[PDB]
From a paper:
Two plasmid-encoded [name] (DHFR) isoforms, DfrA1 and DfrA5, that give rise to high levels of resistance in Gram-negative bacteria were structurally and biochemically characterized to reveal the mechanism of TMP resistance and to support phylogenic groupings for drug development against antibiotic resistant pathogens. Trimethoprim resistance in Enterobacteriaceae occurs almost exclusively through the acquisition of plasmid-associated dfr genes that encode intrinsically insensitive DHFR enzymes.
Crystals of EcDHFR complexed with [name] and UCP1228 diffracted to 2.1 Å and 1.9 Å, and crystallized in the occluded conformation with the Met20 loop occupying the NADPH binding site. Like TMP, the PLA binding mode is dictated through hydrogen bonding with Asp27EcDHFR or Glu28DfrA1/DfrA5, and the propargyl linker forms π–π interactions with Phe31. However, unlike TMP, the bicyclic moiety forms van der Waals contacts with helix C (residues 43–50). Interestingly, the [name] had a distinctly stabilizing effect across all three enzymes, agreeing well with our crystal structures where a racemic mixture of this ligand is likely adopting different binding poses for an optimal configuration.
Residue numbers in the entry:
A (entry chain A), B (entry chain A): 1 to 161
Write the structure that this text describes.
């Protein structure tokens, strides 16, 4: 199945990891832990930010533009992106805002990092209906030496019921 | 012992409950639950906001001004406020910003509600040193019908070690 994983500031603002507070080391280790050995789907700007593939897994870029790097797989539609992952237990959609919006209908699981911080931003995570999603896990953490703000991991699963 | 209980928006902004998002019904029930049958200490503006005593417990107002309501106890110093609670297991300090600051050194426990919302505000909860406080409990909640933002209860205890 298809999962979205995203780090969210207040009012569900999202942004690229190079900047602060998305540079919470704890979130980076959470992200690595939940995408390890799974295929990842991302949009072109996310691919541009990261600059090179995430290791040891299929990296798929969803884009209307022809590909410019042969280390990853380029596709033009959502169904092409899904089919390119093959038969696997879980597909991870890792951003950005437009890709989250396209994949949210088919997604069955969300891995959210709620970061207790203010950031100015244009792009928000999709507005998932609280009614169709069941929170099944949450884990709060205080700000500490390495992490500049408090943050809460959460996992939700679609109430297909 | 002395405990501070407070609802905090991002960057530790605090405000009176009449306004939103401090009007999270879930926080109100959390507040009632943790102050029931305990003496409460508050500053004059908090007393002014609430307009009448919290029922079934000693209400102490810390203020440099002479009292104007005989249903509560008025005192002028922190030690007077503590002594007026008598011999009890737990004293609850319920605001506002100046009272939290005065009582934080003697406090041994914090009940914090982290509300995932933006509010403009002048007054912040005191900047407790993460080093002297151990988080011993946290419980995250999604926004729902009755609660307009997500929120996380947390309890910390002083590392007097
Ligand atoms: C972790 C963030 C993060 N947290 C959560 N919860 N969900 C997410 N979907 C992402 C993300 C992201 C995108 C793909 C992104 C964007 C980037 C990145 C990186 C990056 C990732 C791993 C490593 C390993 N060293 C280095 C960089 C990643 O680097 C510059 O822009
Ligand atoms: C609950 C907020 C709240 N949450 C948390 N975590 N910590 C807190 N220290 C307070 C608070 C507060 C102050 C005392 C306050 C200020 C107010 C209040 C009320 C009020 C309280 C109970 C009831 C019962 N119906 C009604 C009103 C309370 O009403 C107008 O201004």
């Amino acid at each position: 199945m298809i999962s979205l994983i995203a780090a969210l500031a207040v009012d569900r603002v999202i942004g690229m990891e190079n900047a602060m507070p998305w540079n919470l080391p704890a979130d980076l280790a959470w992200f690595k832990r939940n995408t390890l050995d799974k295929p990842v789907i991302m949009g072109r700007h996310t691919w541009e930010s990261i600059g090179r593939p995430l290791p040891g897994r299929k990296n798929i870029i969803l884009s209307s533009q022809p590909g410019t790097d042969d280390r990853v797989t380029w596709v033009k539609s959502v169904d092409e992106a899904i089919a390119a992952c093959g038969d696997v237990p879980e597909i991870m959609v890792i951003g950005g805002g437009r890709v989250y919006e396209q994949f949210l209908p088919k997604a069955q699981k969300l891995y959210l990092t709620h970061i207790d911080a203010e950031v100015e931003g244009d792009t928000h995570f999709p507005d998932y209906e609280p009614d169709d999603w069941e929170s099944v896990f949450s884990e709060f953490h205080d700000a500490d030496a390495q992490n500049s703000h408090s943050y809460c991991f959460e996992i939700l699963e679609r109430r297909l019921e």
